Write an enzyme that holds these catalytic residues in place. Structure first.
Site, PDB file in Angstrom:
ATOM      1  N   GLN A  11       0.808  -1.215   0.000  1.00  0.00           N
ATOM      2  CA  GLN A  11       0.000   0.000   0.000  1.00  0.00           C
ATOM      3  C   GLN A  11       0.844   1.270   0.000  1.00  0.00           C
ATOM      4  O   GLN A  11       0.655   2.144  -0.855  1.00  0.00           O
ATOM      5  CB  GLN A  11      -0.992  -0.010   1.163  1.00  0.00           C
ATOM      6  CG  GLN A  11      -1.694   1.312   1.317  1.00  0.00           C
ATOM      7  CD  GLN A  11      -2.796   1.272   2.328  1.00  0.00           C
ATOM      8  OE1 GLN A  11      -3.125   0.215   2.852  1.00  0.00           O
ATOM      9  NE2 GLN A  11      -3.156   2.445   2.819  1.00  0.00           N
ATOM     10  N   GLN A  15       0.809   3.890  -3.102  1.00  0.00           N
ATOM     11  CA  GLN A  15       0.154   5.180  -2.960  1.00  0.00           C
ATOM     12  C   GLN A  15       1.172   6.309  -3.082  1.00  0.00           C
ATOM     13  O   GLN A  15       0.901   7.352  -3.703  1.00  0.00           O
ATOM     14  CB  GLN A  15      -0.607   5.200  -1.636  1.00  0.00           C
ATOM     15  CG  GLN A  15      -2.029   4.675  -1.779  1.00  0.00           C
ATOM     16  CD  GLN A  15      -2.724   4.419  -0.439  1.00  0.00           C
ATOM     17  OE1 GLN A  15      -2.157   4.680   0.626  1.00  0.00           O
ATOM     18  NE2 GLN A  15      -3.967   3.946  -0.491  1.00  0.00           N
ATOM     19  N   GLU A 254      26.550  10.627  -8.266  1.00  0.00           N
ATOM     20  CA  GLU A 254      27.732  11.325  -7.809  1.00  0.00           C
ATOM     21  C   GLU A 254      27.598  11.571  -6.335  1.00  0.00           C
ATOM     22  O   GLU A 254      28.535  11.352  -5.569  1.00  0.00           O
ATOM     23  CB  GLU A 254      27.868  12.645  -8.547  1.00  0.00           C
ATOM     24  CG  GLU A 254      29.167  12.808  -9.305  1.00  0.00           C
ATOM     25  CD  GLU A 254      29.463  14.255  -9.615  1.00  0.00           C
ATOM     26  OE1 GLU A 254      29.413  15.082  -8.683  1.00  0.00           O
ATOM     27  OE2 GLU A 254      29.737  14.567 -10.790  1.00  0.00           O
TER      28      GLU A 254
HETATM   29  N1  LIG Z   1       3.592   7.688   4.588  1.00  0.00           N
HETATM   30  C1  LIG Z   1       2.724   6.771   4.213  1.00  0.00           C
HETATM   31  N2  LIG Z   1       2.650   5.651   4.987  1.00  0.00           N
HETATM   32  C2  LIG Z   1       1.781   4.665   4.669  1.00  0.00           C
HETATM   33  C3  LIG Z   1       0.981   4.775   3.587  1.00  0.00           C
HETATM   34  N3  LIG Z   1       0.235   3.698   3.491  1.00  0.00           N
HETATM   35  C4  LIG Z   1       0.548   2.871   4.492  1.00  0.00           C
HETATM   36  N4  LIG Z   1       1.497   3.469   5.254  1.00  0.00           N
HETATM   37  C5  LIG Z   1       2.192   2.943   6.452  1.00  0.00           C
HETATM   38  O1  LIG Z   1       2.610   1.639   6.160  1.00  0.00           O
HETATM   39  C6  LIG Z   1       2.606   0.805   7.270  1.00  0.00           C
HETATM   40  C7  LIG Z   1       1.835  -0.441   6.878  1.00  0.00           C
HETATM   41  O2  LIG Z   1       2.311  -0.984   5.669  1.00  0.00           O
HETATM   42  P1  LIG Z   1       1.331  -1.131   4.418  1.00  0.00           P
HETATM   43  O3  LIG Z   1       1.955  -0.449   3.229  1.00  0.00           O
HETATM   44  O4  LIG Z   1      -0.022  -0.579   4.833  1.00  0.00           O
HETATM   45  O5  LIG Z   1       1.166  -2.749   4.283  1.00  0.00           O
HETATM   46  P2  LIG Z   1       1.234  -3.718   2.956  1.00  0.00           P
HETATM   47  O6  LIG Z   1       2.507  -3.496   2.213  1.00  0.00           O
HETATM   48  O7  LIG Z   1       0.003  -3.741   2.055  1.00  0.00           O
HETATM   49  O8  LIG Z   1       1.341  -5.146   3.653  1.00  0.00           O
HETATM   50  P3  LIG Z   1       0.027  -6.042   3.941  1.00  0.00           P
HETATM   51  O9  LIG Z   1      -1.298  -5.290   3.832  1.00  0.00           O
HETATM   52  O10 LIG Z   1       0.227  -6.728   5.288  1.00  0.00           O
HETATM   53  O11 LIG Z   1       0.085  -7.015   2.779  1.00  0.00           O
HETATM   54  C8  LIG Z   1       1.938   1.572   8.381  1.00  0.00           C
HETATM   55  O12 LIG Z   1       2.916   1.921   9.324  1.00  0.00           O
HETATM   56  C9  LIG Z   1       1.352   2.792   7.700  1.00  0.00           C
HETATM   57  O13 LIG Z   1       1.534   3.947   8.463  1.00  0.00           O
HETATM   58  C10 LIG Z   1       1.036   5.866   2.815  1.00  0.00           C
HETATM   59  O14 LIG Z   1       0.265   5.852   1.871  1.00  0.00           O
HETATM   60  N5  LIG Z   1       1.913   6.896   3.108  1.00  0.00           N
HETATM   61 MG   LIG Z   2      -1.916  -3.649   2.346  1.00  0.00          MG
END
Ligand SMILES: Nc1nc2c(ncn2[C@@H]2O[C@H](COP(=O)(O)OP(=O)(O)OP(=O)(O)O)[C@@H](O)[C@H]2O)c(=O)[nH]1
Ligand SMILES: [Mg+2]
Ligand SMILES: Nc1nc2c(ncn2[C@@H]2O[C@H](COP(=O)(O)OP(=O)(O)OP(=O)(O)O)[C@@H](O)[C@H]2O)c(=O)[nH]1
Ligand SMILES: [Ca+2]
Ligand SMILES: [Mg+2]
Lengths: 440, 419, 66
Positions: A11, A15, A254
């Site tokens: 995610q 995103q 660099e």
């Molecule tokens: N800065 C930022 N942090 C994010 C974002 N989306 C998720 N997080 C952070 O990511 C962490 C969770 O990881 P995710 O990316 O949601 O999980 P995932 O990779 O889909 O892994 P699973 O759902 O378990 O398969 C949390 O600590 C969230 O705060 C985002 O869009 N921006």
């Molecule tokens: Mg996820």
């Protein structure tokens, strides 16, 4: 030549990639349908933006990008969003079942069934390249996918592409926007597994980005979108070296040379400025000196650390816009006087500077004000190790009682992996300390 | 999508399950005939989790009983015909509030036809997350047959998530003296074969009906409205667009530090202001168990806030509850209280707060049952009803032993420090 | 000097190759030990359930004698 394939994983990765590629398209005048009225070379070219954007003879510019989630949603929105036509369907790979915040699921159980497919898509993208540089890998520390599948991908990419450069943009976990209680586990796990397979990682601390968005942009409770647009700005500053040109531009590679003293000390601290709101920016122009100084204010940092508690081994300043060498130089001096940038005794104490005159872009309707110049500083402070300490400590609190460990053993992992990962982080903390001690 | 399969077993099970389907069918805009008629698109975005689509919608539910009464009652009543008629699976014998009968003799006849319907639903799923079972632990069908089903289903889907709303028995609400036996037997099964059990204690529902809702003579409907409110609450983050704890598994991972201690305490408010919602929610007089959390320590907590309110107020109040009473939260699981917000409120309320706790105070509940069990067992009383179906005291002896062990473990961790 | 130059580039090629190779090994060991571990766990779970089944048959048989 010089192409960069970007991989967005889980995610946070996907995103943030949404943010970055929209920003990129604005910066280069590419419309949501891939058409770039400014380009006259159709179906190709060797322009700078080509390092990130392949071209079709129908005139569509396509991100040299792959989006990978073990779960349909998020990516699906990309498929159904303002930019659904920028990507081609096979660049967006999704699974059926996420990793339930468990690195053992991302790295093994669930990830192993999609890894070969991802690698094939990546190869499709690579074979479209005439001289591929390496990869930009975007992922969270805390996600199941973002940690486990990312480390799997990194190992396999080191196998299939050798010592090609791999750079990370890592989302470091901060309770304010947390999603799992086990994110320290996932973080230590994935750091230990990736350490060897990454040449440079930019840690972005969600707590730092949350705080800046709140104090400098006045946001009650910032969203992932708020965070991601600030983050995309920082990413764009870091990648603008490769996507644009100019006589004062310097390639990140660099800086890399000067930013990675020893293979393991490859975690640079980033600082961006100016982050202001339109309301404020109105009638308030920031000077090079202003933005520069900000770069040395611990509050405008992407990771929470006190650089003063540590030494510097590198300080690179990447400017964007109406910035001229003279102005910069002065600022640097002034600072050097008013500030204390201590360096290790084995490193030159100068600052590497670069300028891209292409001024910064804002997402319309966003919270950031369009600005006349900005700077992203990249330093190597032993101080970044603080962020490891925090994580390590939290990990320890839980591991001593074996809390949640069963969820990982039940997926194939062994307690030994935990201890090895942890030991590696202990080593990493010792390493940073060592490099900061003075010599004979 | 990510599909859940829902099972109702026994009288109490089918009653609370039928209420739950009424409540969330309303929340999702599904009329008693299966036709969507709601405004927001947020009601149909994750509707795949609990409903199969046929333009109509049919609960992915399987209704199970050894007696035809409660299930006829269900077919007859409100939303009675939203259920796939094939999915009513029932015997005629009954189980006589007898754990041995539901688990070993009568239930064994019926169980294969149940598992048949289970296969049919599971194999029509894109990705089955797991199973949700409603039942009491004090009768016979729900208690014994339900746990037997839990085992059968695990055998066939060992990699899926077992989740139960299990009603714990309380003298003040029934009379069947054997209830402690039945409960101790199924607690045994649950310790081993579920990933997460919401402990709905009839005692607490009584008390909250009597000494808070000020209902001097509570009916099982009075209890079951508390129950259906809780079930909507703890299913919100699974039924509506959102993030924190949206899968049964992620729930399991963020709430179960050790595999046995998976017994959760739900709480709900209003039985207002973010402060009022928050403080009511964390008070005992809002717990659906019976235990006082001030007697033990929160291992993990998840809060859900439903309605239109300020997330700033929600975060402030949540941290205020913790920072203020930081004594009741273990220090070896950092950042163990997570919070989610969903805009859609329950029926009738404009703002609401549900809460899920892995608290060591749950030992109190098991302790209570243990006591009641030993009273009778120390004189082998009413044992004939069971021994005669083929059981041996060893079994009771094992089950009592296992539950005592469960209590001992909840205490150990409560008395654990970091340094 | 020409031989030295040939040796250095030979060393570089060998070292990258050794990297890719050790990576491939380490990863295969890990994936295989994970698969053995996960399978073992599910096997033991299903076997616990099988002993549960055998004891249910035991109970039914014990009653059809009383
Ligand atoms: N800065 C930022 N942090 C994010 C974002 N989306 C998720 N997080 C952070 O990511 C962490 C969770 O990881 P995710 O990316 O949601 O999980 P995932 O990779 O889909 O892994 P699973 O759902 O378990 O398969 C949390 O600590 C969230 O705060 C985002 O869009 N921006
Ligand atoms: Mg996820
Ligand atoms: N909270 C609540 N408890 C109930 C309800 N109906 C029954 N009970 C409780 O259920 C327990 C007994 O379980 P039953 O549902 O009657 O048992 P059963 O599964 O039908 O087993 P048989 O009686 O053999 O058919 C008692 O301790 C009751 O307090 C209900 O609607 N709500
Ligand atoms: Ca071109
Ligand atoms: Mg009854």
């Amino acid at each position: 030549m010089r192409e960069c394939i970007s991989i967005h994983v889980g995610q946070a990765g996907v995103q943030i990639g949404n943010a970055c590629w929209e920003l990129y398209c604005l910066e280069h005048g590419i419309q949501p349908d891939g058409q770039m009225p400014s380009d006259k070379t159709i179906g190709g070219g060797d322009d700078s933006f080509n390092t990130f954007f392949s071209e079709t003879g129908a005139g569509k510019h396509v991100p040299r990008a792959v989006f990978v989630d073990l779960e349909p949603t998020v990516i699906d929105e990309v498929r159904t969003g303002t930019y659904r036509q920028l990507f081609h369907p096979e660049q967006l790979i999704t699974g059926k079942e996420d990793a339930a915040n468990n690195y053992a699921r991302g790295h093994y159980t669930i990830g192993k069934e999609i890894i070969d497919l991802v690698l094939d898509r990546i190869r499709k993208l690579a074979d479209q390249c005439t001289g591929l540089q390496g990869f930009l890998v975007f992922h969270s520390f805390g996600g199941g996918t973002g940690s486990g599948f990312t480390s799997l991908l990194m190992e396999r990419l080191s196998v299939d592409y050798g010592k090609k450069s791999k750079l990370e943009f890592s989302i470091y976990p901060a309770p304010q926007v947390s999603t799992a209680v086990v994110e320290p586990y996932n973080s230590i796990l994935t750091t230990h597994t990736t350490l060897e397979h990454s040449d440079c990682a930019f840690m972005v601390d969600n707590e730092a980005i949350y705080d800046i968005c709140r104090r400098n942009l006045d946001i009650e409770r910032p969203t992932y979108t708020n965070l991601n647009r600030l983050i995309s700005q920082i990413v764009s500053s870091i990648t603008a070296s490769l996507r644009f040109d100019g006589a004062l531009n310097v390639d990140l590679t660099e800086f890399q040379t000067n930013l990675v003293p020893y293979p393991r000390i490859h975690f640079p601290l980033a600082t961006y400025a100016p982050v202001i709101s339109a309301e404020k920016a109105y009638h308030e122009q920031l000077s090079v000196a202003e933005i520069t100084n900000a770069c040395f204010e611990p509050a405008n940092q992407m990771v929470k650390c006190d650089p003063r508690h540590g030494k510097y081994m590198a300080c690179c300043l990447l400017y964007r816009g109406d910035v001229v060498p003279k102005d910069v130089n002065a600022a640097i001096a002034t600072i050097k006087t008013k500030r204390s940038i201590q360096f290790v005794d084995w490193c030159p104490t100068g600052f590497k500077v670069g300028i891209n005159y292409q001024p910064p872009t804002v997402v319309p309707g966003g919270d950031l004000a369009k600005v006349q110049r900005a700077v992203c500083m990249l330093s190597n402070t032993t101080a970044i190790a603080e962020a490891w300490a925090r994580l390590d400590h939290k990990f320890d609190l839980m591991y001593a009682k074996r809390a949640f460990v069963h969820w990982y053993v039940g997926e194939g992992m062994e307690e030994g992996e935990f201890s090895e990962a942890r030991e590696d982080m202990a080593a990493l903390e010792k390493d940073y300390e060592e490099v900061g001690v003075d010599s004979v | 999508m990510r599909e859940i399969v829902h099972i109702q077993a026994g009288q109490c099970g089918n009653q609370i399950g039928a209420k739950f389907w009424e409540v969330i069918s309303d929340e999702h805009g599904i009329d008693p005939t299966g036709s969507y008629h709601g405004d927001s698109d947020l009601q149909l975005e994750r509707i795949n989790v609990y409903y199969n689509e046929a333009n109509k919608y049919v609960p992915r539910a399987i209704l199970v009983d050894l007696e035809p009464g409660t299930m006829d009652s269900v077919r007859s009543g409100p939303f009675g015909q939203i259920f796939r008629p094939d999915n009513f699976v029932f015997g005629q014998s009954g189980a006589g509030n007898n754990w041995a009968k539901g688990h070993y003799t009568e239930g064994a006849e019926l169980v294969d036809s149940v598992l048949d319907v289970v296969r049919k639903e599971s194999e029509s799923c894109d990705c089955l997350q797991g199973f949700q079972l409603t039942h009491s632990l004090g009768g016979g069908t729900g208690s014994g047959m339900g746990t037997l089903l839990i085992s059968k289903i695990r055998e066939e889907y060992p990699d899926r998530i077992m989740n139960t709303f299990s009603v714990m028995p309380s003298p003040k609400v029934s009379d069947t003296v054997v209830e402690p036996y039945n409960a101790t037997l199924s607690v045994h099964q649950l310790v081993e074969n579920t990933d997460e059990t919401y402990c709905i204690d009839n005692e607490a529902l009584y008390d909250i009906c009597f000494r808070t809702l000020k209902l001097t003579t509570p009916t099982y409907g009075d209890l079951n409205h508390l129950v259906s409110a809780t079930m909507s609450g703890v299913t919100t983050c699974l039924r509506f667009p959102g993030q924190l704890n949206a899968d049964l598994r992620k729930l399991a991972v963020n709430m179960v530090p050790f595999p046995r201690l998976h017994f959760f305490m739900p709480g709900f408010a209003p039985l207002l202001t973010v402060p009022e919602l928050t403080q009511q929610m964390f008070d005992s007089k809002n717990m659906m168990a019976a235990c006082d959390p001030r007697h033990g320590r929160y291992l993990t907590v998840a809060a859900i806030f439903r309605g239109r309110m300020s997330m700033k107020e929600v975060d402030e109040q949540m941290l205020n509850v913790q920072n203020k009473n930081s004594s009741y939260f273990v220090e070896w699981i950092p950042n163990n209280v997570k919070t989610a917000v969903c805009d859609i409120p329950p029926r009738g309320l404009k703002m609401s707060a549900t809460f899920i706790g892995n608290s060591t105070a749950i030992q109190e509940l098991f302790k209570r049952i243990s006591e009641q069990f030993t009273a009778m067992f120390r004189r082998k009383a009413f044992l004939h009803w069971y021994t005669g179906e083929g059981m041996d005291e060893m079994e009771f002896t094992e089950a009592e032993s296992n539950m005592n062990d469960l209590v001992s473990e909840y205490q150990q961790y409560q008395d654990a420090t970091a340094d | 000097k020409r031989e030295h130059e040939r040796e250095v580039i030979q060393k570089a090629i060998e070292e990258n190759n050794n990297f890719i190779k050790m990576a491939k090994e380490k990863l295969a060991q890990k994936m295989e030990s994970n698969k053995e571990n996960r399978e073992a766990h599910l096997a033991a779970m299903l076997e616990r359930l099988q002993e549960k089944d055998k004891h249910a048959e035991e109970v039914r048989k014990n009653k059809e004698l009383k």
